Design a protein around this nucleic acid. Sequence first.
RNA 1: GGACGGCUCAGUAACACGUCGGUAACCUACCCUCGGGAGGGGGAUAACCCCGGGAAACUGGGGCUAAUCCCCCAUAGGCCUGAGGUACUGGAAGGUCCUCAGGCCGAAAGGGGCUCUGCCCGCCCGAGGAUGGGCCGGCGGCCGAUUAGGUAGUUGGUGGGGUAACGGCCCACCAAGCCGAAGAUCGGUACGGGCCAUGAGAGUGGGAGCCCGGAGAUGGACACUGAGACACGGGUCCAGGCCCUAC
Lengths: 125, 111, 241, 97
Amino acid sequence: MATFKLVISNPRNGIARQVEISGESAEKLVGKRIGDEIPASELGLNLTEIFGEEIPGDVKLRITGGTDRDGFAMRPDVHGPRRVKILVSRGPGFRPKERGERRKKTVRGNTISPEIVQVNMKLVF
Amino acid sequence: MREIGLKVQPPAEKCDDPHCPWHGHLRIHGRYFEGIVVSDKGKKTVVVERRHYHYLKKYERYELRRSKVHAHNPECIDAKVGDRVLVAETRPISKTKSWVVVAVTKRAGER
Amino acid sequence: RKGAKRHLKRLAAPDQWYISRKRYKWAVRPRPGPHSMKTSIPLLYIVRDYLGYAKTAREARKILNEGRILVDGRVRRDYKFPVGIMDVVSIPETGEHYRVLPNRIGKLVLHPISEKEANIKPLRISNKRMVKGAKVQLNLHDGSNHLVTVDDKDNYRTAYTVLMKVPDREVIEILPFDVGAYVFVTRGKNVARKGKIVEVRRFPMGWPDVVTIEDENGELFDTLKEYAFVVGKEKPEISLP
Amino acid sequence: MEIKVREMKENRLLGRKEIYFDVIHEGEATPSRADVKGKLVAMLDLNPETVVIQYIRSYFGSRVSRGYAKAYESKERMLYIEPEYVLVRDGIIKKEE
RNA sequence: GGACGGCUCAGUAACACGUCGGUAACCUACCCUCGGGAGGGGGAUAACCCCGGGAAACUGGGGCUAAUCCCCCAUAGGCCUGAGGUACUGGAAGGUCCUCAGGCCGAAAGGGGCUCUGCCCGCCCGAGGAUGGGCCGGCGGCCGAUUAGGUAGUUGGUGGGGUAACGGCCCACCAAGCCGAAGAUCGGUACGGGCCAUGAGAGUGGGAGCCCGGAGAUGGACACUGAGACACGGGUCCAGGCCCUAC
Ligand SMILES: [Mg+2]
Ligand SMILES: [Mg+2]
Ligand SMILES: [Mg+2]
């Protein structure tokens, strides 16, 4: 399959909702990178959606990241759909405790693939 | 003319490298001794030999012990093989050189 | 190995502390401070062991943090603070003053004194820089520093002594290093010995200068100029032993 | 029991009289801190609320024990300076749970 | 703050150790003294809230906020060079200081608490000291000649680079030096010492336990951060081995 759990985030409210897509909408998301806007109109999810009120105009989604089935987060700095194991020193995919820790962490690349599960989406007005 | 800390006659001519105590910026500190030159091949580099006697507690006797030092030789003091030079300790000038010749008593003849 | 020392073992301690070296494992490592490790002892040992106002370091630290012990007119709350030669340790609540001075054995002792002398501290000058502003910084043996001017820069010389009023730091009574000057030795073999200077020898290179000193009983002994501390012109005037 | 004081020195820094004393207990066991404290306040009209006994040590072949006690000017100084185990021993404090 | 302490003695025949000395060839947070300063702006982000992902280890997105967090500007200050004056110390000035030039780098938390108009704990710069180290040198301490020639950046020099700092430490170019039969080189063994055992002593032997120093943290190699580590309870890779796993 190509199903995806999208966490949509409204910054106007500071609020978020999880919605699972499972078909050709998901397959349309496939191939997109962090930084790529998409409209909920074609994506399928309604506009009086789970936020209930404060309905948008036809506000457009934008990808911000997400994790895969094995738990590794996409890093926009990395190009491709595949995983790498890199020294990072502060990035998404690493929460450093000491001042100069620099651990090597496995991450996923920016562009979406079937192996993704969590997909973070800010709605952009 | 400067008066480096140990009273002995300076050279006559005054033109040298900065690694000369009197005419350059080299400093001397620590220990100083007289010794005999046994090599003068290297440019601005001689080998000075001491000869002290070492006591053996067991055999109640003495043995000679030679010690070379590898000093710097400024052209104002062009000490040659045989001369009783005065040598003094300074900073490292090379891998082996940490000493500098300052004065001479020449020796055309030896035994 | 990888860095500095934060500890001290009581056997590896200075030889001039009166410490009871085998009773425990550890000793107070002195902080960096006025004097050196060779001419100091920590205030904890002074409060607990010498004077006996505490059997325990917790009591001593409580005292020091209450502020009952001055060192040259200043409250010292740190138990690792170095207290050195010719230092004045005052306890006002008890009306006591002590001069830290060395013994003939070479160890540091507290000589009792009164308030008048307790407002005095003699300082061997020990160096003299020219600092910005074209001012003269006297660099004194307690690691202290005094600024003077290019007018009396010549009245101030290196091995001289300066009497100092310490809670204010006002120079009184410069005492020069000359012949006839009364002197108190601080280190060496002839440690807590005193007398008048007789001679000085120079010794070309970095070999330290040496002074010949005449005691009260007419004897005549040498030591180092750096270990010769001037206390007076003809009389010690600081109540030494 | 017989108390015989050796030394009684003041400490204004901490605020306490420090008493060193002998307890002669010929023929009896070395006495209890309670009894020693009572006899001590009597011998010296001290405030038992502030008197604290540090040690009573009996030696080999002596039946003359040696003791160190402390007499604070204030119970608050006593509770601040003196440690909890000493206070518990003299019974000033019931261990707090 | 964690670079101490604590453990071990593999390696190492070496300036590793001991001792005398040197650093005018260097670094030093905490601490002391003195002398000065704290001006003007700005920003983000944890915690928290919404939603989570992943077997775990771990980790994402959005919203919100502060600081003794972070950034900027200027003033001080720091470094280099050039010129000259000769006030300082030193045994001796490539040092300090004074004046002038050209430049580059470039601070700070007037923060917090009280009995608040004063006090306490604090921030930055400079000068020195102290503390702790780095580096240099003289002397000193095993075996083997069925190990005799060794060395090729090797010895030195000129000029540089680099370093906290001197240095063939490294580089370019010049030369042919350096070590050695008083035993080099190679091999063997070994942490060094204070000390210990023994013995009339001379001496022979040992150098786990306590202190001092050194080195190492499965083997090997490399870095980040920090005053300080190439870091036993931090990081990365290889080798080797083991553990959990939803492989
Ligand atoms: Mg700026
Ligand atoms: Mg071994
Ligand atoms: Mg193991």
